[PDB]
């Protein structure tokens, strides 16, 4: 019935695919998740909204999803939607691995889930999946990798990035602080801290820490202990108490 | 009824095939041509029945074509053995089974120089040499006694030579021309034909 | 107006409003006759040309030997409806080696045009059909319509003006069942003429005839073939 | 199956789904094409913190045949895989490689498909084929939203797309061809009237005869850029 | 009372989460002006509804709202007719359907059940209505005695001491709480009485032998029987010497 | 039927038929989950509008397999597809892996039956939040599922009529130490909180869950336990 | 927002009517028949220098002895191009013989009112073609030229023009033939006809022009024989 | 108004319109009677002539469903008919399956049942159609049922279905039928017809009479024509 028909999969006046559109509005919402790649590693830290008192801690992460052995995503959005998603991430990367005995290409895997995306933007008259995806990995052709994909079926490889609550507050931050080819992953923890600390409002509670590193040949994929994020979080105290001191103390000599 | 034959060294895949294309009691060509190029650094040898062994070479050649054209690098030799093994042994128990025996001969940046013996069953096994057809009971004892893994191109050639020699010798089909081609860290080499008086 | 658009939405009157726009398609078209004697069936029909450098529409179309059609509304329609008939009576000749009786192929038309009349997202058929043919009941002139509805007739008009063709049929009928060939194709003529305005009259390329009968099988006549019949009468 | 028609004429004889796909073409990065003697060049409009190579508008679909696009770029992956097979699948079925104008003619009946087919919406992308034919004739051809196709000398698509057309038909000489190295200024030409800085925001790709598609890098662009300085002033 | 886009047209949540299109089928069930009561008893259960035949030239024998589901399962259907016929229907063979495939008479609950199911999709799924009819089944369970069912276009159902449905629904239900707490024995011809009253204080009508038909299971005799007028008349008769 | 989704995103981001749904959830009847040192409870409120209806009938505290159980807060009808569906998927995973299903693997596999109904044609979403408990690493399990197929797995929770306060008396107290008879205690006095009129062992329904399995405790368990008040 | 099998009060299919609006957008062709041969015309309205002329194909062979000419959405038309050139070969496979001008143009026609949405294949016509054609060829009856709209009507003519002048160069037409005109006065009348009702300076780059004769193959003109016929 | 566009919607008051406006149709359209005797069930339809220029049995709104079952329609025809065939499928299936003629109150029960499915959903229309049923076997006797757009399905002792529905309905019940022969009741039956029928609005009309019963051995069939005329006079004589 055509009085009833939302229309999902069809064109504006000026070239817009609405729902699409509405679709990143529901991202804005959704906790602020950001990705830093370094020479060393490639990490993801995400902003936890699933933080009460009487909540359980059944799960090794919130919004962290290993996708298979050099892969792991961070999600913003419809949670349900995105539990979909990653699922057939983790489907498509053992169809690669079942075909020519070997990992996908963190791109390849990317693009695959992308096209399924793409799909729902088409045809078929069904709302898309309201959920933006960052993709950490590496692979024998480009190494270590970072992704971002959005409900359009839309994808880039980055540097570092951000999806969710104050995204570009956060990616302009990134902008100033990123120096390309000079990255390690302890800068790169010290900068994830930096910046979520102005783009929320900072327990180590509120946050989650995830790093992929390679040690003898194997992907290490690893959520940082409770303790270790305070750690980070410390010691970025006492580089804002030290610029304090280099501000007041450096215009009266 | 037909031959292949693989010797793998340190830094090279050294293959030969026959070159008669039959039909019946006659010799229809001399110069038919076994060996299918899959990547700069990847070569099929195919060979069994008359359809089967050109349709399931070319399928496999154009979908390895593909994977190159949709991400800018070509599948490493083991990938391409198992996408080949993948798909002759989806068919085995469908309506179309193919009846192909095969080698993949082929060279890796980082894994080095690799052949792959694959029977019609599609069971994989990677070997430092390997023979296909009833020349195979003629020329796998060869091998076996002259073989070493430091074996040269050189070297190799000569060995190929002696497997070449023997079939000339007791083996009761004809083959008397030879493909034969090398595969290293700069791609496919065609070296020249084992040809017998 | 939100009853309008479509055939399953009966508006509150009892009327279905997308089944009388269909009905339309068929006023719209050229004039058709259709009448019978006790031995012939005959269909005459006003052929439209778009230009004087275009030939006139074909108005008359064969099913089988002992069938033929004069169409009014939708070309694509009728062509499909057509091909549906001539299909039913391939059917019957092949398995029963015998003439589709022709009530039974109006039955057909009738149950085959009713089903998108009530289905969501389907249409009624915009076209009508006049029926010529002969079969063990004699002589018969079928109507078919966009509403799926048929009728049985001794004679019948149907398209634009075709009220006028109406008005001679329904005073010459008591004629009709006895006329010999010639009398009852220029009573058909003589209709047709009444809904041509006063100016224009009946020439050998506005005028289609199809003739099937006790010894006729169904004939098509057009352009020279119609002058034996447009000689009897001058207004 | 959702079997709703999504394209259908307006009462003015407008098919407003085609023209709206044709609006996000409208807002795409500017691309163009020149067909040279011996070569043909792709040149395409462009974040500091992004790869460059994950986002590139100049894609390959077979040994000879090379593509850019402008509008929605996740459509245009679509269109460009399924072109991609087809090149394969044409070897496949008659042996021989693909035409340009064979491919082209499948990218275009492909989106017009999009156009009368019930549950889905157009491509929103237009598309810049190159590529030289197995007689080693030079080839350009442009699709759009619609499904229509034309072969041309030089072209632009998206942003900008007329005044760059018209640069192009008052610059498109024998004298601007002659040379393998003017046709890539030609371009760089073009492409300096809607890119603001140029070099920086430019991604370019050259195919040659029998050579395969050479994407080249900022140094190499910016050469070319300082070569037509010297001739604005001289 | 909020509504927004279509939640009155079709069975999708209003901004206050209602399904007003369930609500509108509750509604069609008065459009048919009956009033049906269930009471259930020690060894018992009994159905009764009202019988409006307003004209001689029709066949008094096809009007009714009585079914036989089973030999042990019968309803009374309260709502639209065509509407409640065909969920007999679809009673009728979930019932056969299951003693065919687990090898058993059905038990009443599960039959219950199984229509509230089926009425549940129309509830979630778009393209087609809710039934608007309500089905009170009876039957004697073998371990548990006798049962009164009843499911709603809704998808609701239940199991009850005594229940009604149609236009006087809440007058009866109010009648049928006061009587069923005070301590009863509720033996065959109590639990007849209690029905019959019931419809007769909540309508005002001092009913006619043809002005109802009732339906009943017991311990002694669970298979489904509806009642003569001749039956009926000795029930209104002993009910008048009080 | 119709193959078009019935929710959508609206112009601000949401999907308004995933929370018209949340809100008759939130006018449904309390449900209490606490969950114990050594296992768990389901409280809820099964008030009837008359004496007439057949209390021991129907059930809202309902198991799922051995180990596992459930209670909601919303639409009755919705809740039994749940049902059905939870108890069908629990024996689709004990065929496979011959195992009783983790009870986060059961929680999971519901979630995404309840968000197809967000996004798959010509239907709305379930009216239903569940409480799912259990018992499967010699450890106890309590899970929300709500109507967009979001679950978060809690050491207490309340839903539907006066949520909010029940959470807040449930924050106060819980303590992670408690012992399920004590757990019991403190899920009655919850429901206590919000509950309109006099409580007694046949208006209020209470699930159990520990190291023997899941079950429901009778009226006269009930009835023992509303007698310490 | 009506379905796109919606009849208007008038009797006719609303989509089908905008289809014939969608065509008057469409560039103008003319086709004459003759005793001596059809002649098809068509004016190529070249938007850029840049584009290369050679590559706008509105007039197209079907078959050795039939041509087509074309009006409106040109993508639309090269599906039933390619349909007609199918049911040729499919007819000579199964036959052994060729098609006459009619039944191709009926064979094309019976796909016009193949649209909808309920009760369709996965993939079938949501809308109508948004074309006109002229097919121009020679049979067993002669020289013959037929005319078909989106609605499927086709119909036999003398002459005649569609697009965007068509109501104008239609009265050229009526005008200027006789039945007994030769195939040269044919291909001039079309020629000024096209020259009166084009925007730009016709030139044998601007118009594409093409005879079906009756001892002769369809032809396409070459620039040099378009040059040597646009002196005249 | 806006509640009334679709079967699957009902209206605030717990209404279903698209089903009430297929009603109307009906109610609009010309009267059939079908009254049941002692010895069978006999049927008259009020048949208005469009046009002179029609034989004499076109457009008949009394069908043979099965050999021994009749239909009486009133309503939209093509509908009707649709209905007829339905029922002669079903009527025919049930022969197949069990091997003899299927029962009349079994007939009315699975027609109505496909009648109620077309008042349920947005994919289709109901039906605009009201049809009697009628048949005479030993061992079952005389039966009349009748079915409406809704799908509602019951047994009558006289029926009487659009425009003067109620107007036949008064003249049905000055007949004590249970004690009348076949025979006797087709002058009844044509003279109800006759008083209903309006001669000013609807100017000329056909009387179509069919039966079933003792007198046929139970199969359905026309009212031969000495009869039909013999009731055909005696209605006009009636009528003076
Ligand atoms: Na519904």
């Not at chain 1, 504006?12 to 020479?39: D, F, K």
């Not at chain 5, 024998?61 to 036989?68: A, G, I, P, Q, Y």
């Not at chain 5, 799924?125 to 009876?138: K, V």
């Not at chain 8, 179509?208 to 139970?218: A, F, M, R």
Request: proline share 3%; with cysteine.
């Amino acid at each position: 019935s055509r009085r009833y028909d939302s229309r999902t999969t069809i064109f504006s006046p000026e070239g817009r695919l609405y729902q699409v559109e509405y679709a990143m509005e529901a991202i804005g919402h959704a906790g602020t998740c950001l990705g830093i790649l370094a020479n060393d590693g490639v990490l993801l830290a995400a902003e936890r909204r699933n933080i009460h008192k009487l909540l359980d801690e059944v799960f090794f992460s919130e919004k962290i999803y290993k996708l298979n052995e050099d892969m792991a995503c961070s999600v913003a959005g419809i949670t349900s939607d995105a539990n979909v998603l990653t699922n057939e991430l983790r489907l498509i990367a053992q169809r690669y691995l079942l075909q020519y005995q070997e990992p996908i290409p963190c791109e390849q895997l990317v693009t695959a889930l992308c096209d399924i995306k793409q799909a729902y933007t088409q045809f078929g008259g069904k709302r898309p999946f309201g959920v933006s995806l960052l993709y950490i990995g590496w692979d024998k052709h480009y190494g270590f990798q970072l992704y971002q994909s959005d409900p359009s079926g839309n994808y880039g490889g980055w540097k570092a990035t951000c999806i969710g609550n104050n995204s570009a507050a956060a990616v302009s931050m990134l902008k100033q602080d990123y120096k390309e080819g000079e990255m390690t992953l302890k800068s790169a923890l010290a900068l994830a801290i930096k910046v979520l600390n102005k783009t929320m409002d900072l327990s180590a509670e509120k946050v989650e820490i995830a790093t992929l590193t390679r040690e003898n040949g194997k992907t290490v994929i690893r959520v940082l202990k409770q303790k270790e994020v305070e750690q980070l979080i410390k010691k970025h105290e006492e580089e804002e108490a030290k610029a304090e001191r280099e501000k007041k103390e450096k215009e009266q000599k | 009824m037909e031959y292949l034959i693989g010797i793998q060294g340190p830094d090279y895949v050294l293959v030969a095939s026959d070159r008669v294309a039959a039909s019946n009691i006659v010799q229809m060509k001399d110069d038919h041509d076994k060996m299918f190029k899959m990547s700069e650094k990847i070569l099929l040898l195919c060979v069994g029945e008359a359809g089967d062994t050109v349709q399931f070479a070319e399928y496999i050649q154009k979908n390895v074509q593909l994977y190159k054209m949709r991400n800018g690098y070509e599948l490493s030799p083991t990938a391409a053995a198992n996408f080949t093994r993948r798909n002759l042994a989806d068919c085995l128990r469908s309506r179309t089974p193919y009846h192909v025996n095969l080698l993949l001969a082929g060279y890796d940046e980082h894994e080095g120089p690799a052949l792959y013996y694959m029977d019609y069953l599609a069971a994989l096994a990677k070997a430092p040499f390997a023979a296909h057809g009833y020349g195979a009971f003629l020329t796998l004892s060869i091998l076996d006694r002259y073989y070493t893994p430091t074996i040269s191109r050189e070297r190799a050639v000569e060995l190929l030579r002696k497997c070449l020699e023997e079939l000339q010798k007791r083996f009761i089909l004809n083959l008397p021309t030879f493909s034969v081609r090398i595969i290293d860290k700069n791609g496919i080499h065609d070296l020249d034909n084992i040809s017998f008086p | 107006n939100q009853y309008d658009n479509d055939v399953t939405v009966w508006s509150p009157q009892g009327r279905i409003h997308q089944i009388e726009y269909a009905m339309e398609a068929v006023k719209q078209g050229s004039a058709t006759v259709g009448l019978k004697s006790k031995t012939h069936a005959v269909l005459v029909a006003l052929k439209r040309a778009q230009s004087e450098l275009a030939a006139h529409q074909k108005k008359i179309l064969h099913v089988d030997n002992h069938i033929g059609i004069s169409i009014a509304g939708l070309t694509a329609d009728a062509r499909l409806l057509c091909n549906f008939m001539r299909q039913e009576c391939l059917d019957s000749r092949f398995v029963f080696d015998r003439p589709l009786p022709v009530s039974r192929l109006v039955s057909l038309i009738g149950s085959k045009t009713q089903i998108p009349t009530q289905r969501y997202g389907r249409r009624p058929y915009g076209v009508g059909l006049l029926i010529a043919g002969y079969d063990d009941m004699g002589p018969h002139i079928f109507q078919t319509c966009p509403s799926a509805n048929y009728f049985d007739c001794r004679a019948m008009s149907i398209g634009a003006r075709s009220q006028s063709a109406r008005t001679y049929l329904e005073r010459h009928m008591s004629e009709f069942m006895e006329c010999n060939l010639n009398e009852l194709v220029k009573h058909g003529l003589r209709a047709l003429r009444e809904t041509l305005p006063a100016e224009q009259d009946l020439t050998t390329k506005n005028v289609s005839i199809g003739i099937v009968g006790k010894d006729l099988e169904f004939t098509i006549y057009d352009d020279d073939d119609v002058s034996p019949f447009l000689e009897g009468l001058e207004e | 199956s959702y079997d709703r028609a999504i394209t259908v004429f307006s009462p003015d004889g407008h098919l407003f789904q085609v023209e709206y796909a044709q609006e996000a073409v409208k807002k795409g990065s500017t691309a163009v094409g020149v067909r040279g003697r011996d070569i043909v060049v792709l040149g395409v409009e462009k974040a500091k913190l992004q790869d460059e190579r994950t986002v590139r508008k100049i894609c390959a679909l077979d040994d000879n045949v090379c593509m850019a696009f402008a509008g929605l770029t996740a459509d245009a992956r679509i269109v460009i895989n399924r072109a991609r097979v087809e090149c394969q699948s044409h070897r496949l079925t008659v042996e021989d490689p693909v035409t340009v104008e064979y491919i082209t003619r499948y990218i275009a009946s492909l989106k017009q498909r999009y156009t009368q087919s019930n549950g889905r919406r157009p491509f929103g992308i237009s598309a810049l084929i190159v590529g030289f034919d197995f007689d080693g004739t030079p080839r350009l051809y442009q699709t759009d939203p619609s499904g229509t196709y034309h072969a041309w000398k030089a072209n632009a698509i998206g942003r900008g797309a007329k005044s760059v057309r018209e640069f192009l038909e008052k610059n498109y000489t024998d004298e601007a061809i002659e040379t393998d190295d003017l046709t890539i200024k030609l371009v760089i030409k073009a492409l300096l009237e809607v890119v603001q800085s140029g070099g920086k925001n430019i991604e370019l790709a050259v195919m040659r005869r029998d050579q395969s598609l050479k994407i080249l890098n900022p140094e190499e662009i910016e050469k070319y850029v300082a070569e037509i300085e010297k001739e604005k002033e001289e | 009372g909020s509504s927004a886009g279509f939640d009155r047209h079709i069975t999708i949540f209003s901004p206050e989460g209602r399904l007003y299109q369930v609500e509108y089928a509750f509604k069609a069930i008065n459009q048919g002006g009956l009033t049906s009561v269930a009471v259930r008893g020690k060894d018992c259960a009994v159905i009764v509804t009202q019988k409006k035949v307003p004209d001689k030239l029709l066949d008094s024998s096809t009007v009714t709202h009585l079914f036989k589901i089973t030999e042990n399962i019968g309803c009374v259907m309260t709502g639209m007719t065509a509407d409640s016929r065909s969920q007999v229907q679809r009673a009728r063979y979930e019932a056969a359907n299951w003693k065919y495939k687990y090898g058993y008479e059905i038990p009443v609950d599960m039959l219950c059940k199984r229509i509230a199911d089926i009425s549940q999709v129309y509830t979630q799924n778009a393209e087609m209505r809710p039934l608007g009819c309500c089905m009170i089944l009876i039957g004697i369970d073998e371990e548990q005695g006798p049962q009164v069912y009843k499911c709603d276009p809704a998808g609701y159902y239940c199991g009850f001491k005594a229940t009604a449905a149609g236009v006087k629904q809440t007058e009866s239900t109010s009648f049928l709480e006061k009587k069923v707490k005070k301590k009863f024995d509720w033996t065959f011809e109590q639990t007849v009485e209690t029905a019959i009253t019931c419809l007769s204080t909540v309508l005002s009508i001092d009913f006619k032998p043809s002005e109802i038909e009732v339906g009943v299971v017991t311990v002694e005799n669970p298979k489904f029987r509806i009642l003569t007028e001749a039956e009926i008349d000795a029930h209104l008769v002993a009910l008048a010497e009080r | 039927g119709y193959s078009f989704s019935l929710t959508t995103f609206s112009p601000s981001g949401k999907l308004v038929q995933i929370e018209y749904a949340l809100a008759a959830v939130a006018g449904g009847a309390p449900s209490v989950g606490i969950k114990a040192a050594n296992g768990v409870v389901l409280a809820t409120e099964k008030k009837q509008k008359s004496i007439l209806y057949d209390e021991r009938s129907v059930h809202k505290v309902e198991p799922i397999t051995k180990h596992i159980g459930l209670v909601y807060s919303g639409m009755g009808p919705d809740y039994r597809v749940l049902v059905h569906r939870a108890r069908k998927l629990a024996q689709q995973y004990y065929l496979v892996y011959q195992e009783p299903i983790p009870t986060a693997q059961l929680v999971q596999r519901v979630a995404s039956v309840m968000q197809e109904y967000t996004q798959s044609g010509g239907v709305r979403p379930f009216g239903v939040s569940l409480l799912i408990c259990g018992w499967n690493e010699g450890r106890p399990y309590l899970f929300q599922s709500d109507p967009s197929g979001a679950y978060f797995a809690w050491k207490a929770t309340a839903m539907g009529k006066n949520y909010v306060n029940g959470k807040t008396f449930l924050e106060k107290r819980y303590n992670e130490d408690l012992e399920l008879e004590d757990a019991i205690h403190t899920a009655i006095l919850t429901l206590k909180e919000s509950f309109e009129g006099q409580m007694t062992e046949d208006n209020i329904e209470v699930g159990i869950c520990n190291e023997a399995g899941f079950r429901r405790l009778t009226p006269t368990e009930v009835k023992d336990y509303l007698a310490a008040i | 927002d009506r379905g796109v099998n919606t009849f208007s009060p008038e009797g006719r299919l609303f989509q089908v009517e905008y289809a014939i609006e969608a065509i008057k957008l469409g560039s103008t062709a003319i086709g004459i028949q003759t005793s001596e041969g059809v002649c098809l015309a068509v004016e190529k309205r070249i938007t850029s220098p840049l584009m290369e002329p050679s590559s706008i194909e509105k007039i197209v062979e079907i078959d050795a002895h039939i041509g087509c000419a074309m009006s409106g959405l040109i993508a639309d038309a090269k599906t039933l191009i390619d349909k007609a050139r199918v049911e040729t070969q499919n007819h000579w496979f199964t036959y052994n013989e060729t098609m006459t001008v009619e039944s191709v143009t009926q064979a094309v026609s019976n796909l016009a009112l193949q649209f909808g949405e309920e009760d369709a294949d996965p993939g079938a016509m949501s809308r109508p073609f948004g074309v006109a054609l002229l097919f121009g060829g020679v049979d067993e009856k002669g020289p013959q030229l037929f005319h078909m709209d989106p609605s499927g009507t086709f119909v036999q003519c003398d002459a005649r023009a569609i697009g965007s002048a068509s109501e104008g160069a239609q009265s050229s037409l009526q005008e200027v033939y006789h039945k007994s005109m030769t195939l040269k006065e044919a291909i001039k009348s079309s020629l000024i006809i096209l020259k009166q009702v084009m925007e730009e300076k016709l030139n044998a780059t601007n118009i594409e022009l093409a005879t079906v004769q009756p001892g002769q193959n369809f032809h396409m003109f070459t620039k040099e024989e378009l040059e040597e016929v646009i002196k005249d | 108004t806006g509640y009334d566009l679709s079967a699957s919607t009902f209206s605030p008051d717990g209404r279903v319109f698209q089903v009430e406006y297929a009603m109307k149709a009906v109610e609009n359209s010309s009267t059939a009677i079908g009254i049941r005797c002692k010895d069978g069930v006999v049927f008259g339809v009020e048949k208005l002539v469009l046009s002179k220029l029609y034989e004499e049995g076109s457009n008949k709104r009394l069908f043979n469903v099965d050999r021994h079952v009749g239909m009486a329609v009133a309503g939209l025809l093509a509908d009707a008919r649709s209905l007829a065939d339905i029922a002669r499928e079903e009527a025919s299936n049930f022969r197949s399956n069990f091997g003899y003629n299927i029962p009349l109150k079994h007939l009315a029960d699975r027609v109505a049942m496909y009648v109620h499915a077309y008042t349920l959903y947005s994919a289709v229309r109901p039906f605009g159609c009201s049809f009697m049923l009628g048949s005479y076997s030993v061992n079952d006797g005389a039966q009349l049922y009748m079915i409406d757009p809704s799908g509602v399905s019951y047994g009558y002792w006289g029926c009487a279905i659009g425009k003067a529905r109620q107007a036949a309905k008064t003249e049905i019940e000055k007949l004590q039928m249970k004690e009348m022969t076949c025979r006797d009741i087709v002058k009844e039956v044509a003279k109800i017809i006759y008083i209903v029928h309006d001669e000013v609005k609807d100017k000329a009309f056909e009387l179509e009479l069919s039966w079933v019963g003792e007198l046929t051995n139970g199969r359905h069939e026309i009212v031969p024509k000495d009869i039909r005329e013999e009731a055909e006079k005696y209605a006009k004589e009636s009528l003076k």
